[PDB]
Ligand binder design. Structure first.
Ligand SMILES: Nc1ncnc2c1ncn2[C@@H]1O[C@H](COP(=O)(O)OP(=O)(O)OP(=O)(O)O)[C@@H](O)[C@H]1O
Ligand SMILES: [Mg+2]
Length: 264
């Protein structure tokens, strides 16, 4: 499981460099918080959806769990192997397969089931060599979604206790992404403790807990139901869109941000 009791963390010199790699020294000198009074309790097998305004601390909270940012006040409790899957989808030179099982024991069943749920079948079938196509470093002629699904597969194949998925559903092939959410994150991963950063409303619905950050602070925590009751101005605005989850990542963040400001 993963517990966070009143946690706060400050700009440490060097942290913002890592945040580029995944002005800073002014935030460091001045001593601001990057997250502030963060609280959450996720029990084994639960799925936490994290969302919020753009630049609100979401990736920084993942760096906290990974142990890259140092929590000044608070307790952070969790244990085991943790599998991280960043926004930036990196690709090592080698085959699509090699990339997915990087430095980890092959397991024909486990592999086929990840490859499958992550919607990579539609993809590797396009290629003369299937999942034995060799990729150049950075996976460059691929699409943004293709890289993202390769990077997700790689991360989900890893066997671990906690899975941190940072924003893999933000590209244009929006239906595949709906498939992937459902087969991978919701079915195949259903028994694994997993945190998902996201700007799609659907993911909030189907989650166990929810965390919405804004200007570094927790603007909400607790379940999807509580969200509608407790922050209703929020809930009205967002839920009352036609197909908000098929807006671009860019437009979804814009509204989340404009909305979080209105009702602070
Ligand atoms: N590449 C960057 N250049 C300058 N400042 C940055 C950069 N990445 C993050 N920050 C700063 O660190 C804090 C934000 O980051 P985090 O990286 O925690 O945001 P998120 O909540 O993950 O948002 P985003 O949609 O940008 O990923 C912000 O207040 C922002 O000012
Ligand atoms: Mg982020």
């Amino acid at each position: 499981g993963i517990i966070m009791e009143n946690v706060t963390a400050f700009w440490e010199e060097g942290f913002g460099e890592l945040l580029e790699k995944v002005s800073f020294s002014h935030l460091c000198l001045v001593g601001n918080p990057v997250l502030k009074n963060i609280n959450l309790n996720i029990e084994k097998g639960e799925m936490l959806a994290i969302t919020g305004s753009t630049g609100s601390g979401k990736t920084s909270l993942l760096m906290l769990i990974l142990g890259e940012l140092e929590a000044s006040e608070g307790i952070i409790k969790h244990s085991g192997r943790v599998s991280f899957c960043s926004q930036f989808s990196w690709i090592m030179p080698g085959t699509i397969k090699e990339n997915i099982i990087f430095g980890v024991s092959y397991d024909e069943y486990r592999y086929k089931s990840v490859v499958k749920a992550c919607q990579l079948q539609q993809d590797i079938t396009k290629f003369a060599e299937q999942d034995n196509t060799v990729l150049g470093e950075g996976g460059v002629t691929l699409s943004g979604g293709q890289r993202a699904r390769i990077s997700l597969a790689r991360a989900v194949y890893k066997d671990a206790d906690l899975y941190l998925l940072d924003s893999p559903f933000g590209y244009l092939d929006v239906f595949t992404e709906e498939q992937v959410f459902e087969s991978c994150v919701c079915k195949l991963m259903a028994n694994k403790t997993r945190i998902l950063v996201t700007s799609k409303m659907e993911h909030l619905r189907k989650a166990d807990k929810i965390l919405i950050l804004h200007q570094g602070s927790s603007y909400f925590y607790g379940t999807f139901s509580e969200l509608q009751s407790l922050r209703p101005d929020f809930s009205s605005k967002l839920m009352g869109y036609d197909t908000f989850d098929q807006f671009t990542e860019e437009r979804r963040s814009s509204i989340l941000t404009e909305t979080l400001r209105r009702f602070s």
